[PDB]
Design a protein around this ligand. Structure first.
Ligand code: MG
Ligand code: MG
Ligand code: MG
Ligand code: MG
Ligand code: MG
Ligand code: MG
Ligand code: MG
Ligand code: MG
Ligand code: MG
Ligand code: MG
Ligand code: MG
Ligand code: MG
Ligand code: MG
Ligand code: MG
Ligand code: MG
Ligand code: MG
Ligand code: MG
Lengths: 97, 63, 127, 25, 226
RNA sequence: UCCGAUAUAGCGUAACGGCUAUCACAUCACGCUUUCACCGUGGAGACCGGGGUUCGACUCCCCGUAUCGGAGCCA
RNA sequence: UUCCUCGUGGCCCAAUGGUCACGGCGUCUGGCUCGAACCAGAAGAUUCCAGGUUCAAGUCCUGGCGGGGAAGCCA
RNA sequence: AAUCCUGGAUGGAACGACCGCGACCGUAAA
RNA sequence: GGUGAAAUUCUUGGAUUUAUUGAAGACUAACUACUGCGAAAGCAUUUGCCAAGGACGUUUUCAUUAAUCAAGAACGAAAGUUAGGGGAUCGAAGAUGAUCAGAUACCGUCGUAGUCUUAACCAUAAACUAUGCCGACUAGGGAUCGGGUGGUGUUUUUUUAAUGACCCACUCGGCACCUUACGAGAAAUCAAAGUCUUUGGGUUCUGGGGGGAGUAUGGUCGCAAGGCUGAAACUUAAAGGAAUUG
């Protein structure tokens, strides 16, 4: 039977959505169906920042961040301890935690 | 052949496939205010003391 | 007061490069990799290998006369991962602890404007 | 068997029959 | 990995830092600080003339390192070597650029991104490609959550920006342009010209690149370095 | 015939006249994994043959055997 | 008919004249788990037949047998 | 009365459904 | 370099890596969203030209010109075919390195055709909302795209104006969404899949147990690959849908 009303994705009124590639397995997946996440991370760590600030000229500086938008396929996302699996009722939950 | 003393201040949890390894947050006795995380084999407590043969390394924390 | 170089860390999976250059990049000093400090082909990407590489690099830096360094951290980029390997931050902390000075870290991974084509096929790398 | 491959088999058969009949036609 | 090489050489020690000498980089006069750093070359033998290997070099340096302020912290500057007079080699402007961190921090979703480019030339026969960027702004009192533009606003904004850049680069030679860029007045003009079209936050400009230089003209170069 | 190179543990390979000689593979064990593979640690194993120089020859000099490459060739 | 080659554990194949003979598959025993795969281990030979050469013949020499191959042309 | 801050995962292999007798054939489960 | 680990591969003739350029061809990241346009297929860099289209507004015009539609026609992803160009990337074939009992598979490295384009062909798809088009009615709620109206509303301009961008209310038309079931349904679920045994708004297409079979044959189209049309013998008591506890 049918599992989802969106069927897997976010294509109502388009027809075609121009695939992207998964970051891990390189699988072609439609962009609407993909999972998008955004991995924003300080460059070094929360641990080495003390050493960096101590060994840094230019005090006050910033320690800038790294930004990349991650696209995973369903299989990779389920394997990587992301959108894992949900009960029939909580599948409808569209919000984050 | 230098070594480094480190005092345990916080036990985090067990680690390893079979549970024979423990994560600890040690603070160095000399060069204090430095707090590294290490793997430990045997029974360990806080206020225990470890002898790091190599100090410039951190274990992959599980949390 | 400080004499500056450019560290140019390339933290790939399967390897890590630390190699410092002058401000222009044409003149290079002390290129060390993780596979020069280990014997596996498995730990070339290891933080320990990166740390030892950075230690040797800082030693040669202070042997030459370089005291400070700007950091350009890099991943494979292009069509590939675009996220850095494990041995980048380790090398950074290493050549911070060794005695060098740091200034103006940047992330310089080559990012495309919708690149040519990723490898693996449309059906993926299957395993 | 998968219907796609049953179809491919049937097509290769239709092709071989087309030519073994062109032998006489 | 160390002992994995089956053959080091297809068919079958000397330190090179005894062979090298240092060289100090001098920036132009449209920069508060001149001493950019030091560079290496080999001693100029009778057949290499290290000045020649050192002439066409390019050095990337922070505008914060050139000006003192950390507000010009992203804002990289590419300086091109042009002349050597006794260990204080002199540079000129080769281009400007932003840092990936700044560009990515600017690029957020649920707002419209606007990009423009012009390929204009200056009075000193330099040919420059100037890139401008802007992002839509969610007004105060705004309740709807995205604030997109309407794709004719985008075109009008882009027209305004392009004509402003062609107007402001024509008349500025190259150093006049650099002194126009450093205080970020172009951004203020763009904001004043677009505020009647769309709000437009973050009107930081973008990288500048040189496409075609005129011939050398050592005089205009040394007019900078006093 | 001339030049050059090579012969080294069971295979192959590296070497400074201050070592009956390191190396990856082969095998002897000890280890590690559910097992299998992968992997780590100690071992036992060899300087083509014969003369000469030398406080000291794998190593240098001479001769000979075998191999390779290129050059040559009036019984 | 002539010439060349080969004959080896149940099968395929190898060997310096120098241990009543290397390997692999098969078989058997035990183990893991019911069977395969896998881990350990064992057994099995008158080296085609008949002669000789040597301190020693699988090999070195002659004939036969069987298997394969080449030649059998000018008219 | 001093006081600037942080979150984060990779991973090798893993077939099947069951038997016996020199001849075809014979026997078996819910 | 690659991998889970490796090996094939490249490397003192300097590989990988750094910097500075140049060439080529492809692609159009991030912005990119339960957002938009299009008959669908499909369409994402800028600018210009060419023509087209919907929605809204309208105290404009014609005046039933309309709805659906056998036959008939245009368009029709990808692959594929013909011929030229182009040919970076990836890469059906193929070669190789492994893994494996085997592995002419998955993994790795190379790599032709193809992937791009011009002029023609092909006319297929899970071409899917697996839901034909037109029309009317029937429940609430809020958001959003486009247009329009109103508001002494906020802000910016030149305190001021007109704008533009926002806020509030309303409306037409869209893409959708949340809640409920009066109702429907085998149920999953549905604002249509409702207004259906209280059975008729209009109209086209298709199916009648499962296999054999979208096969054989004959026509027709197509360069071909194949497409469209399309049986019978024979066989069978179950195939199948949705849910339930294990
Ligand atoms: Mg299912
Ligand atoms: Mg489609
Ligand atoms: Mg057995
Ligand atoms: Mg079977
Ligand atoms: Mg079977
Ligand atoms: Mg190089
Ligand atoms: Mg874009
Ligand atoms: Mg839009
Ligand atoms: Mg069809
Ligand atoms: Mg259909
Ligand atoms: Mg209706
Ligand atoms: Mg509206
Ligand atoms: Mg509406
Ligand atoms: Mg719409
Ligand atoms: Mg019937
Ligand atoms: Mg039927
Ligand atoms: Mg079912």
């Amino acid at each position: 039977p049918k599992k989802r009303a969106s069927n897997g994705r976010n294509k109502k009124g388009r027809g075609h959505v121009k695939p992207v590639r998964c970051v891990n397995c390189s699988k072609s997946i439609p962009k609407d169906k993909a999972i998008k996440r955004m991995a924003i991370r300080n460059i070094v760590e929360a641990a080495a920042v003390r050493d960096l600030s101590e060994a840094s000229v230019y005090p006050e500086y910033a320690l800038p961040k790294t930004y990349n938008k991650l696209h995973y396929c369903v299989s990779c996302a389920i394997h990587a301890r992301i959108v894992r699996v949900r009960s029939r009722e909580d599948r409808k939950n569209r919000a984050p935690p | 052949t230098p070594v480094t003393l480190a005092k345990v201040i916080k036990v985090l949890g067990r680690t390893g496939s079979r549970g024979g390894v423990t994560q600890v947050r040690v603070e160095f006795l000399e060069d204090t205010s430095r707090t590294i995380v290490r793997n430990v084999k045997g029974p360990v407590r806080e206020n225990d003391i470890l002898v790091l043969m190599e100090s410039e390394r951190e274990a992959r924390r599980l949390r | 007061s400080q004499v500056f170089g450019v560290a140019r860390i390339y933290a790939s999976f399967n390897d890590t490069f630390v190699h410092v250059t002058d401000l222009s990049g044409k003149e290079t000093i002390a290129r060390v990799t993780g596979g020069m400090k280990v014997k596996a082909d498995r730990d070339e990407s290891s933080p320990y290998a990166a740390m030892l590489a950075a230690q040797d690099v800082a030693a040669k830096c202070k042997e030459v006369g370089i005291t400070a360094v700007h950091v350009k951290i890099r991943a494979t980029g292009g069509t590939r991962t675009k996220t850095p390997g494990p041995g980048g931050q380790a090398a950074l902390r290493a050549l911070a602890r060794s005695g060098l000075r740091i200034g103006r870290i940047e992330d310089v991974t080559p990012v495309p404007s919708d690149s040519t084509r990723k490898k693996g096929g449309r059906r993926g790398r299957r395993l | 068997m998968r219907a796609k491959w049953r179809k491919k088999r049937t097509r290769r058969l239709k092709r071989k029959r087309r030519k073994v009949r062109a032998r006489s036609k | 990995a160390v002992g994995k090489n089956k053959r080091l050489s297809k068919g079958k020690v000397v330190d090179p830092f005894t062979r090298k000498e240092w060289f100090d980089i001098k920036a132009p006069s449209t920069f508060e600080n001149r001493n950019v750093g030091k560079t290496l070359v080999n001693k100029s033998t009778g057949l290499k003339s290290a000045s020649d290997a050192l002439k066409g070099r390019v050095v990337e340096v922070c505008l914060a390192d050139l000006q003192g302020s950390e507000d010009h912290s992203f804002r990289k500057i590419k300086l091109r070597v042009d002349e050597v007079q006794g260990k204080n080699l002199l540079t000129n402007f080769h281009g400007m650029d932003f840092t990936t961190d700044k560009l990515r921090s600017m690029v957020r979703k649920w707002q419209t991104l606007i990009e423009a480019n012009v390929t204009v030339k200056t009075s000193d026969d330099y040919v420059l490609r100037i890139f401008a960027i802007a992002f839509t702004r969610k007004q105060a009192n705004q309740v709807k959550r995205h604030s997109y533009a309407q794709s004719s606003h985008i075109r009008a904004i882009r027209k305004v920006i392009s004509e402003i850049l062609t107007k402001e680069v024509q008349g500025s030679t190259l150093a006049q342009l650099t002194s126009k860029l450093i205080p970020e007045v172009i951004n203020k003009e763009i904001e004043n010209a677009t505020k009647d079209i769309f709000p437009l936050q973050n009107i930081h400009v973008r990288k500048v690149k040189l496409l075609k230089q005129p011939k050398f003209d050592v005089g205009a170069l040394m007019a900078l370095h006093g």
